[PDB]
Design a protein around this motif. Structure first.
Motif, PDB file in Angstrom:
ATOM      1  N   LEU G  48       0.824  -1.206   0.000  1.00 12.19           N
ATOM      2  CA  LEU G  48       0.000   0.000   0.000  1.00 12.19           C
ATOM      3  C   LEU G  48       0.860   1.257   0.000  1.00 12.19           C
ATOM      4  CD1 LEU G  48      -2.839   1.241   0.153  1.00 12.19           C
ATOM      5  CD2 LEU G  48      -2.530   1.331   2.639  1.00 12.19           C
ATOM      6  N   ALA G  49       1.907   1.281   0.825  1.00 12.07           N
ATOM      7  CA  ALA G  49       2.828   2.411   0.813  1.00 12.07           C
ATOM      8  C   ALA G  49       3.558   2.506  -0.519  1.00 12.07           C
ATOM      9  CB  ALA G  49       3.820   2.297   1.969  1.00 12.07           C
ATOM     10  N   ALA G  50       3.902   1.361  -1.112  1.00 13.53           N
ATOM     11  CA  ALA G  50       4.451   1.373  -2.463  1.00 13.53           C
ATOM     12  C   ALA G  50       3.452   1.906  -3.485  1.00 13.53           C
ATOM     13  CB  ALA G  50       4.903  -0.031  -2.861  1.00 13.53           C
ATOM     14  N   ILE G  67       7.090 -11.084   4.597  1.00 16.20           N
ATOM     15  CA  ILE G  67       5.888 -10.624   5.279  1.00 16.20           C
ATOM     16  C   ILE G  67       5.284  -9.534   4.399  1.00 16.20           C
ATOM     17  CG2 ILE G  67       4.990  -9.492   7.326  1.00 16.20           C
ATOM     18  CD1 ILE G  67       7.452 -10.772   8.784  1.00 16.20           C
ATOM     19  N   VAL G  68       4.226  -9.875   3.675  1.00 13.26           N
ATOM     20  CA  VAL G  68       3.635  -8.984   2.685  1.00 13.26           C
ATOM     21  C   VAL G  68       2.365  -8.375   3.261  1.00 13.26           C
ATOM     22  CG1 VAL G  68       2.677  -8.807   0.393  1.00 13.26           C
ATOM     23  CG2 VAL G  68       4.630 -10.267   0.783  1.00 13.26           C
ATOM     24  N   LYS G  69       2.242  -7.055   3.146  1.00 17.01           N
ATOM     25  CA  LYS G  69       1.098  -6.304   3.642  1.00 17.01           C
ATOM     26  C   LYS G  69       0.368  -5.683   2.462  1.00 17.01           C
ATOM     27  CE  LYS G  69       2.058  -3.499   6.900  1.00 17.01           C
ATOM     28  NZ  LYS G  69       2.780  -2.465   7.675  1.00 17.01           N
ATOM     29  N   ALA G  70      -0.946  -5.874   2.409  1.00 14.32           N
ATOM     30  CA  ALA G  70      -1.728  -5.407   1.275  1.00 14.32           C
ATOM     31  C   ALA G  70      -3.175  -5.228   1.696  1.00 14.32           C
ATOM     32  CB  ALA G  70      -1.635  -6.375   0.093  1.00 14.32           C
ATOM     33  N   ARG G  71      -3.923  -4.492   0.873  1.00 14.23           N
ATOM     34  CA  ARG G  71      -5.351  -4.319   1.110  1.00 14.23           C
ATOM     35  C   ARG G  71      -6.147  -5.495   0.563  1.00 14.23           C
ATOM     36  NH1 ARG G  71      -6.235   2.192  -0.257  1.00 14.23           N
ATOM     37  NH2 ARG G  71      -6.258   2.854   1.928  1.00 14.23           N
ATOM     38  N   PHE G  72      -5.866  -5.894  -0.672  1.00 14.67           N
ATOM     39  CA  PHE G  72      -6.531  -7.017  -1.312  1.00 14.67           C
ATOM     40  C   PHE G  72      -5.471  -7.958  -1.861  1.00 14.67           C
ATOM     41  CE2 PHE G  72     -10.741  -5.115  -1.214  1.00 14.67           C
ATOM     42  CZ  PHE G  72     -10.457  -3.767  -1.196  1.00 14.67           C
TER      43      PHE G  72
END
Lengths: 99, 182, 52, 52, 46, 86, 92
Positions: G48-50, G67-72
RNA sequence: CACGGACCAAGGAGUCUAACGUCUAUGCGAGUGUUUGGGUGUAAAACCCAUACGCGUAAUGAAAGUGAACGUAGGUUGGGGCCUCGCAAGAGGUGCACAAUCGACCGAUCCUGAUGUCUUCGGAUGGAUUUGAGUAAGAGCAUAGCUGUUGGGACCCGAAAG
């Protein structure tokens, strides 16, 4: 409620620590005061009733509150305003006959 | 279906360089007129609205009355001391509130107010409060962490969230039915 | 420092000097190098005798 | 100037009068009256495709 | 409409020739060239 | 692409050949391992050159190619996809 | 074929693929994170920051846990991250 | 046939601009575009630059939505080059672009419908028809040049008007 930290569903949205803002008195814009009530009651006693209010009273007596509300909606343009006017006339009838 | 059959207007910016010079001259003139004060007021940090931009912070209009009170000053005095105050913004985010309070504390510790009657000590003019107190994007996570996987399947989580939002109304009608069934 | 080098980054953000597409501009010496000279066939004649 | 050669009161004399159909200055009492106007081939008219 | 040839005394005039008639139409060689072209176009494109 | 170059070198008997591109060699972040190879090209993008050098190869020009292999011995000349430009 | 249709979803949602996921790690750290692939110090990638909304699973990633962070996220993308040993954390 | 042409001089008509597009050149390249603005200046120049933004890197469906590796990114046929044998001729090997074909993956359509469950939510797995500028180791972005189309008075002069 409390945001669930995910981007969809019920109560979706990011979760941050909550704060309660002070309630702004402009949001207290329609509130009634004791002197305001006193003035409105005295002015009502002095001025009496508009003719459409008189026939609303007559309708409430004779043809029914439903028809009184319908006529009030015709003369006011808004259903909530018709409800307010009919309740006001009902209170006036109760105070002017029973108590 | 239908064409534009008429003649347009033309605006040409031949004065682009001249206007850059004029803005630079006006800024220098204002700096001389208000020296040794900066050209800009202190502005708060604020989250951008909408889901496209809410991932970042930007400069806002002015500090909330609550934030000014927490920083330990009144709105009138803060306005005279060089702080933007915005009465119509409200606080519901403690992160933003804390950041703005710390911002005000640092600004107070970094400025020197001269006595309104006494002799003025020598102090050079700093033009940009914005440059001296830059807005910083808040740190979200540390760079490297340990892995914690309990097999919950985030994709399944999203599908179930959509399902709950989609069938909430029917289950609520059935809850009322369970209430009204004796 | 302004334009960078093989061991110095240019002060211009993300700038590197253009690359050469040929190592040596002098192509006569490339042609006269030993590898090409021992790879090529013998040359003909620049001028030819008129017959008939 | 976008008005140059354009601020004249002139009209064509029409067909059949054995003269070129260019618009001509009306009125009388001066040498200008009856002279061709507005045309890039007319003395005192607009230039072709005036510079902008 | 009296037809007047724009020639002799009548060539290059903006006013009225000797014609007494209220309505007069001046005519030209250039006019007859154009009119012939118009007639043949009318015949072709009918 | 450097991915195209590496896939070409993955052919049997083609690991030690020198790859020739009359054109630009571009980088590709979709490959995480790159072999050691010698590539001749008109132009190397900065990323592709860095990847080849890091993998341990060398980038040479076409005149250096002419000196090394005057008849183009042990070469593998490649062409990029075309219909991509529509 | 609904006429004058106007959508009402998350309007902004740019997609990224797994084969380009590792470009969100800087070059200075990419080599060492690829070399030492530990579950206890996995790199945290904030998509998301990317500037991305959803993560698709076209490519192949190495077996380094991330460790991957995402909305969808798509099912295949989540499956490949889990197979490599990482995890997807949903954010809002 | 008709129309223009007595003679001389000077003037005299495919232009500028916007938006799309091909082709070429140049830069960089999974990116690309400094010039809204800020900095700076020997001052409309040259030089430098942050944050955004466009286009591109993902498609498909009416939509909600879903979203591109079984495999050496597949097999078959052809295939520039290169490799081996071959003093010569010839045969093999490996195959770029590209083309034809049979598959695989994504989306859409129709069926099977189970592991799990607040008992009806979820669609695992397995099939069939087509369909798309789809995927299958990216090709784009920008600037210039010659140009094409359309709109602006639009190659120049001339029209029966409101």
């Amino acid at each position: 409620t409390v945001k669930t930290g995910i981007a969809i569903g019920l109560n979706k949205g990011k979760k941050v620590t909550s704060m309660t803002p002070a309630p702004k008195i402009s949001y207290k814009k329609g509130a009634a005061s004791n002197r305001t009530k006193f003035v409105r009651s005295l002015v009502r006693e002095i001025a009496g009733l508009s003719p459409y209010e008189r026939r609303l009273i007559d309708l409430i007596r004779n043809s029914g509150e439903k028809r009184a509300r319908k006529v009030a909606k015709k003369r006011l343009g808004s259903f909530t305003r018709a409800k307010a006017k009919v309740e006001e006339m009902n209170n006036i009838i109760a105070a002017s006959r029973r108590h | 279906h239908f064409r534009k059959h008429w003649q347009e207007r033309v605006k040409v910016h031949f004065d682009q360089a001249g206007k850059k010079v004029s803005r630079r001259n006006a800024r220098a003139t204002r700096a001389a007129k208000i020296a040794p004060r900066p050209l800009d007021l202190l502005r708060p940090v604020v989250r951008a609205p909408t889901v496209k931009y809410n991932r970042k912070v930007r400069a806002g209009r002015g500090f909330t009355l609550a934030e000014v009170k927490a920083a330990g000053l009144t709105a009138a005095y803060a306005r005279t001391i060089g702080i933007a105050v915005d009465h119509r913004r409200q606080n519901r985010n403690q992160e933003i509130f804390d950041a703005n309070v710390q911002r005000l504390k640092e600004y107070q510790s970094k400025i020197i107010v001269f006595p309104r009657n006494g002799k003025a000590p020598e102090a050079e003019q700093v033009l940009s409060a914005a440059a001296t107190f830059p807005i910083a994007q808040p740190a979200t996570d540390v760079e490297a962490r340990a892995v914690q996987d309990n097999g919950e399947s985030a994709f399944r989580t999203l599908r179930l969230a959509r399902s709950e939002k989609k069938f909430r109304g029917i289950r609520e009608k059935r809850a009322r039915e369970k209430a009204e069934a004796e | 420092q302004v334009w960078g080098s093989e061991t110095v980054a240019s002060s211009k953000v993300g700038y590197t000097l253009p690359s050469h597409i040929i190592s040596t501009s002098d192509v006569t010496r490339i042609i006269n190098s030993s590898e090409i000279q021992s790879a090529i066939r013998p040359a003909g004649q620049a001028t030819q005798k008129r017959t008939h | 100037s976008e008005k140059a050669g354009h601020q004249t009161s002139a009209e064509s004399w029409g067909t059949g009068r054995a003269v070129a159909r260019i618009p001509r200055v009306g009125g009388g009492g001066t040498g200008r009256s009856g002279q061709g106007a507005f045309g890039n081939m007319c003395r005192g008219g607009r230039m072709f495709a005036p510079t902008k | 409409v009296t037809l007047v040839v724009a020639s002799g005394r009548n060539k290059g005039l903006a006013g009225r020739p000797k014609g007494v008639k209220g309505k007069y139409k001046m005519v030209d060689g250039v006019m007859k060239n154009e009119q012939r072209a118009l007639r043949r176009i009318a015949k072709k494109h009918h | 692409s450097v991915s195209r170059i590496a896939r070409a070198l993955k052919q049997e008997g083609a690991a030690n050949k020198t790859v020739v591109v009359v054109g630009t060699v571009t980088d590709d972040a979709r490959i995480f391992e790159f072999p050691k190879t010698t590539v001749a090209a008109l132009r190397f993008t900065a990323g592709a050159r860095a990847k080849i050098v890091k993998a341990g190869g060398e980038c040479i020009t076409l005149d250096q190619l002419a000196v090394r292999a005057p008849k183009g011995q042990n070469t593998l000349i490649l062409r990029g996809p075309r219909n991509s430009r529509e | 074929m609904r006429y004058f249709h106007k959508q009402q979803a998350h309007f902004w949602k740019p997609v990224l693929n797994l084969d380009k996921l590792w470009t969100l790690i800087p070059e200075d750290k990419r080599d060492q994170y690829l070399k030492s692939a530990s579950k206890e110090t996995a790199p945290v990638i904030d998509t998301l920051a990317a500037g991305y909304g959803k993560i698709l699973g076209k490519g192949r990633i190495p077996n380094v846990p991330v460790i991957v962070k995402a909305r969808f996220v798509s099912k295949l993308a989540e499956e490949k991250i889990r197979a490599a040993g990482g995890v997807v954390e949903l954010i809002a």
